[PDB]
Amino acid sequence: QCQDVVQDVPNVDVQMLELYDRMSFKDIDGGVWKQGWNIKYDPLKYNAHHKLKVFVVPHSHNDPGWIQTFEEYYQHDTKHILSNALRHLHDNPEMKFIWAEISYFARFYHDLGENKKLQMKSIVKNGQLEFVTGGWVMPDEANSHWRNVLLQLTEGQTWLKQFMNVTPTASWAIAPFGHSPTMPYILQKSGFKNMLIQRTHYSVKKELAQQRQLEFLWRQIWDNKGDTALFTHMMPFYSYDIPHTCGPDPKVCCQFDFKRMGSFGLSCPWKVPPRTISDQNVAARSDLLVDQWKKKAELYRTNVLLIPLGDDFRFKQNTEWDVQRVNYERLFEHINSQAHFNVQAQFGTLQEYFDAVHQAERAGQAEFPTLSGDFFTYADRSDNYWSGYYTSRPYHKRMDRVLMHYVRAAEMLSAWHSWDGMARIEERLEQARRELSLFQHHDGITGTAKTHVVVDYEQRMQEALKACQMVMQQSVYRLLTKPSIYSPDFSFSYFTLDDSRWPGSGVEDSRTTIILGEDILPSKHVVMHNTLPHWREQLVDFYVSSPFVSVTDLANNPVEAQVSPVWSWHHDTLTKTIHPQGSTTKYRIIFKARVPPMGLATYVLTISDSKPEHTSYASNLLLRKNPTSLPLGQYPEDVKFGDPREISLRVGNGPTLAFSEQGLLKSIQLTQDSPHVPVHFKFLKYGVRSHGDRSGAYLFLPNGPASPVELGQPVVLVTKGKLESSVSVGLPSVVHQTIMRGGAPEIRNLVDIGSLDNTEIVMRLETHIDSGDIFYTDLNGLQFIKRRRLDKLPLQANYYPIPSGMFIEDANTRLTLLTGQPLGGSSLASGELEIMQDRRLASDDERGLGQGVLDNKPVLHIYRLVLEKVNNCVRPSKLHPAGYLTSAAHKASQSLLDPLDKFIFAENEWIGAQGQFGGDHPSAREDLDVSVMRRLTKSSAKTQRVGYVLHRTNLMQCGTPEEHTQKLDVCHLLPNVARCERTTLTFLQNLEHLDGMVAPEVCPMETAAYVSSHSS
């Protein structure tokens, strides 16, 4: 029986929204612990029968790209770290080391000779070298989609299982800029038992330390029972470096970082250096160190203390290993043999720490508090809130979501069949998965890497996109060709993908025009794929070389179509205006595609000599003073002109939208009768402070509230069609487009911040909704969390990640903005939503990047805007920390993140073409998704295995009866099932053998993975 995720408010010891509402956030000088207080302890707490057990855990933080590329770091640093770790752990059996980033480990291990491979396996098997988390990367937690977090986790852990025979159950996340409960959600469903985090607001650290609530059972905000709970250790101090990990006083801790004595070119900023430990100083050195340890121990509830020992790209040099080990070993021998300290200290791993903690727990020595909520937005000091990276490098943030979908579609389309090794399907998929996985890094998607590194990530993602296209088009050709005719050349392009929104019109001219002519080719077959497990209709568009084109399905039934011009916007440096030009050689044909669950549908575009019976033509109206003609070649309807004026548009039975004379939305009217609800789009700009701390790739430090962009008298293009209408306007830095297809409008912004330095461009919605100080934003496209605007915090602190959506509501009305890209946003006043488009910053913000953000490029941001009445919806109570989408808002999100894929047959004639694939696939309830379908075995395996990740969201009950839907049993999607197993989300561990070989559907908010086994 499913837990109810709406109506019962979990009773937790710490609820982060509630904590935020009560805490003061005062930035007072706490002493040597600058953001804390002078910790005191009772020397008598520890004694002979109750010792402080201390685990010193060596580690090295390796970025897969930041200041250097992945490969540059691997060559310069990481290969030497790992080679030295191998040698040193081999030679010194007591020494320990933890490793997080499997992308680097896999790269290293692959290059190892067999002898060294065996030595590596042995130091892993005996517990000396321990993998923590074991993801491809240590991902960003703000911008990343949960699906990509899981992908990168699986990529690393799958490698680890195969080659190292280990699956980590403890996670180490020292570096993401703030933390998401999406992590324990995924980890707990992937066999994890424990996790550790570091970058949380200094006020939160202070507050939880005071209550000894730095270790907690982290459960989801809607989880009443507590089954999602994962034990979490928050580190207490400012950094994960050695000076901030031994205890409260960095001036003391720095003296126990033995790499800082001079020969390594490092020093202690506190002006007191480390000194080599000798018999003459060991007593006083131990006095100091033990005192730090005991202070740190006061902040926690057991007699087991974690002491991380490391920093960025540490343990690189042979002499570094020795100097750390030998000095710590002198300290341990003295400390452990001095009874008065009542301490037992040793090198340990992370799992060792957690094991001992839980032993203390089980001996009744400690009980841990429960917690729900998130740890955004991070500030490491004063008013330096890390909300900048929610937006930095928006082009690549958008690319992430595009590749996210291509990877899923490529894996799904090819999963239906087993492929010969010659097809190189597995090879292309692995490359795509790894490149997408790499980008999840906390300097990848965050946009906090150097310019040349950002370029590396883009190059890597482009190759992944190409790999996905190859797999997809080979798969379509196979699924839709009579088997006895199917004749694959595995290097041949049977279909080319056509993507309307990536890179996007005005970003790159990348789409092929379907070239038809009564002297060249009369028709073209196209194919749509629907990765979602339900029947779907969506308008699709193609470029064609003639406006006289009509559409049929493969039963030759006419399909109603619309033809519109191809409009491109140009910043005209002669006229000094941004205005549209119509193509005289290409046209857009638009029609409604209908596609089976997880399936494919074929249509045919055919040329004629004159206007086809089932194809209409959009009117076009260019609104501006001083117009000139806009010829459209063969297009059958003349462009009309007018002075700027308010306009109103309605497609189908849909909403009626009213626009200002500047081409911006002003109101939405849901039905013929209802109010024109005030909903105004506005573009504004934030600056940078002229003195004090400057905004950079990480930090958002505005010089006050945003100011309106001066719009002048912009050119407005109105296109009106039976299937699709739109209003587009050429604003400074933005071509803003409102598109209507009969439901919630789509918004597209072609954002080109040009050379406007020290500017952040925000898009704001102004309504009269009585939201007060409440708004909702999502975490990793997984869940919506209630936010409260706090005026006791600066503007930048009220910014949150908008990875896929945000909304405001009152008793009666909700406005939901859904995104096709992660960006930063807020509700800075009742009735408002805003979301940053791009940011261009001249200065570095002193977090190590060593540069500003001056490499902006045009990006096409996409959105859906959903205005709804919600007075009839069953919503959570006022004290519940979650929110939930409606059915319409959820479908709108799916249309942005997982649209229909479009394929154009690349040759003249497709012999043996079939009309449809998947017509017999079950059409599942709308809240359910097949997030992943992946074949897990190569063709040579006798027993074939296919993995499925199944996710159910939770949608509001608002009085709309449920359509008739079919039970989806993933284990019976493929023929000849011999076994169905429930597994961890990584597919790595079998959890339940399933009766009747039937996969149950999952509960609201839950995610399950299944593997079906098949006789081959």
Ligand X SMILES: OC[C@H]1O[C@H](O)[C@@H](O)[C@@H](O)[C@@H]1O
Rounded Cα–Cα distance for residues 763 and 745 (Å): 16
Residue 314 contact among ligand X, Zn ion, none, beta carbon within 5 to 8 Å by kind: none
By CB atoms closer than 10 A (0-12, 13-18, 19+), residue 556 is exposed
Q: Which entry of Zn ion, ligand X, none binds 334, CB below 5 to 8 A by partner kind?
A: none
848's contact among ligand X, Zn ion, none, with CB below 5 to 8 A by partner kind, is ligand X
In angstroms, the CA 150 to CA 190 distance is 9
Closest by Cα among 96, 124, 170 to 349:
96
The answer to whether 168 and 189 are in contact (CB under 8 A) is: no
* CA-wise closest residue to 658 among 731, 718, 580, 735: 718
Which run of H or of E encompasses 436? Answer: helix 425-439
Residue 274: half-sphere exposure toward Cβ, Cα within 13 Å: 24
Question: Which residue carries 């720095």 as its tokens?
Answer: 254
Give the largest CA-CA distance in the chain. 100
Binding residues for ligand X, rule CB under 6 A, total: 10
Instruction: Tell me the three state secondary structure of residue 20.
Output: helix
We find the least distance from the C-beta atom of residue 849 to ligand X, in angstroms, to be 7
The contact pattern for ligand X, residues 149-178, with x = CB under 6 A and - = no contact, is --------------------------x---
Our CB check for Zn ion shows the closer of 453 and 897 to be 453
CB of 785 to ligand X, least distance (A): 24
Own/partner long-range contacts of 121-125 (Cβ < 8 Å, ≥24 apart): 121/164, 121/165, 122/90, 123/86, 123/89, 123/90, 124/164, 124/166, 125/165
Distance CA(24)–CA(793), nearest Å, equals 9
Q: Minimal distance in Å, beta carbon 23 to ligand X?
A: 24
Are 177 and 1010 in contact, with CB atoms under 8 Å apart?
no
Cβ 191 to ligand X, closest distance in Å?
Answer: 26
Q: What angle do CA 794, 796, 798 make, to 5 degrees?
A: 80
**Nearer Cβ to ligand X, position 152 or 1012?**
152
In the complex with ligand X, the residue whose CB is nearer, 390 or 587, is 390
Q: Give me the least distance between CB of 443 and Zn ion, in Å please.
A: 6
Residue 448 touches which member of Zn ion, ligand X, none, C-beta under 5-8 Å by kind: ligand X
Strand partners, 56: 307, 347
Q: Which of ligand X, Zn ion, none does 421 bind, CB closer than 5 to 8 A by kind?
A: none
Q: Which does 1007 bind (CB under 5 to 8 A by kind): ligand X, Zn ion, none?
A: none
Identify what 312 binds: Zn ion, ligand X, none; CB under 5 to 8 Å per kind.
ligand X
Note whether 596 and 533 are within 8 A (CB).
no
Q: Is 66 in the site for ligand X (CB under 6 A)?
A: yes
Residue nearer to ligand X on the CB measure, 20 or 700: 700
Beta strand 561-572 pairing with 882-883: unpaired
Cβ-contact 399, 461 below 8 angstroms: yes
- When the beta carbons of 10 and 176 are compared against ligand X, the nearer one is 176
Q: Which residue is nearest to Zn ion (CB)?
A: 175
Interface with ligand X, residue 443, by CB under 6 A: yes
What b/e readout covers 595-615, taking b as 16+ CB neighbours within 10 angstroms?
bbbbbbbbbbbebeeeebeeb
Cβ distance to ligand X smaller for residue 156 or 655: 156
Backbone angles phi, psi at 832, to 5 degrees: -110, 150
Query: 901-905 and 523-530 as β-strands: parallel, antiparallel, unpaired?
Result: antiparallel
Choose between 448 and 796: whose C-beta lies nearer to ligand X: 448
Q: Of 692 and 848, which CB lies nearer to ligand X in the complex structure?
A: 848
* Of 167-175, 232-240, 460-468, 785-793: span binding Zn ion (CB under 5 A): 167-175
Q: How do 304-312 and 52-61 pair as beta strands? A: parallel
Structure tokens at 275: 């000194």
Q: Is the CB of 73 or the CB of 567 nearer to ligand X?
A: 73
Q: Confirm or reject binding of residue 448 to ligand X (CB under 6 A).
A: yes
Residues 312-331 that bind ligand X (CB under 6 A): 312
φ, ψ for residue 244 (rounded to 5)? -110, 20
Q: C-beta of 260: minimal distance to ligand X in Å?
A: 17
Residue 103 C-beta: closest distance to ligand X, Å: 14
- Residue 442 binds ligand X, judged by CB under 6 A: yes
Q: Least distance from C-beta 431 to ligand X, angstroms?
A: 24
Q: Verify binding: residue 850, ligand X, rule CB under 6 A.
A: no
- 């990765």: which residue's tokens? 531
Rg over alpha carbons for the chain, rounded to the nearest Å, is 30
Write the interaction track for Zn ion spanning residues 63-82; mark x where CB under 5 A is met and - where it is not: x-------------------
Angle, vertex CA 133, rays to CA 128 and CA 138, nearest 5: 120
CA-based nearest residue to 524, from 600, 605, 592: 605
Stretch that binds ligand X, among 58-66, 405-413, 482-490, 589-597 (CB under 6 A): 58-66
Letters for 169-188 (x = contact with Zn ion by CB under 5 A, - = none) are ------x-------------
Residue 381 or 967: the one with the smaller Cβ distance to ligand X is 381
Q: Are 889 and 805 in contact (CB under 8 A)?
A: yes
Of the candidate residues 848, 850, 919, 996, the single one contacting ligand X (CB under 6 A)? 848
Q: Are 529 and 595 in contact (CB under 8 A)?
A: yes
- The closest of 996, 986, 1002 to 133, measured between CA atoms, is 986
316 binds, among Zn ion, ligand X, none (CB under 5 to 8 A by kind): none
Q: What's the closest the beta carbon of residue 203 comes to ligand X, in angstroms?
A: 19
Tell how strand 665-669 and strand 577-595 pair up: unpaired
Write down the least CB distance from residue 66 to ligand X, Å.
Answer: 5
Which of 421, 290, 292, 313 shows the shortest CA–CA distance to 84? 313
Find the shortest distance in angstroms from Cβ 314 to Zn ion. Answer: 12
**Partner interacting with residue 456 (select from Zn ion, ligand X, none; CB below 5-8 Å by kind):** none
* Residue closer to Zn ion (CB basis): 452 or 645: 452
Of 178 and 394, nearer to ligand X (C-beta) is: 178
Binding marks (x or -) toward Zn ion, 194..213, rule CB under 5 A?
--------------------
Residue number, 65 or 730, with CB nearest to Zn ion: 65
State the nearest-atom distance from the C-beta of 448 to ligand X, in Å: 5
With respect to Zn ion, which residue has the nearer C-beta, 176 or 373? Answer: 176
Residues 257-316 that bind ligand X (CB under 6 A): 312
Q: Does 130 bind ligand X (CB under 6 A)?
A: no
- CB of 714: closest distance to ligand X in angstroms? 39
Q: Which is nearer to ligand X, 234 or 480 (CB)?
A: 234
How is residue 242 annotated by DSSP? G
Name the one range near ligand X by CB under 6 A: 61-69, 496-504, 594-602, 902-910: 61-69
User: Which of these segments, 125-133, 440-448, 500-508, 513-521, binds ligand X (CB under 6 A)?
Assistant: 440-448
Q: Should residue 63 be labelled a site residue for ligand X when binding is judged by CB under 6 A?
A: yes
Least distance from ligand X to the Cβ atom of residue 61, Å? 6
C-alpha 480/C-alpha 104 separation (Å) is: 40
Nearest distance from residue 200's CB to ligand X, in Å? 14
Q: Where are the beta strands (DSSP E) in 286-394?
A: 304-312, 343-347, 370-372
In the three-class reduction of DSSP (H, G, I as helix; E, B as strand; rest coil), residue 337 is classed as helix
Applying CB under 5 A, the site for Zn ion has a residue count of 2
Rounded distance, CA 198 to CA 214, Å?
Answer: 10
Residue 130 C-beta-side C-alpha neighbours within 13 Å: 23
Residues that bind ligand X (CB under 6 A): 61, 63, 66, 175, 312, 442-443, 448, 847-848
Residues that bind Zn ion (CB under 5 A): 63, 175
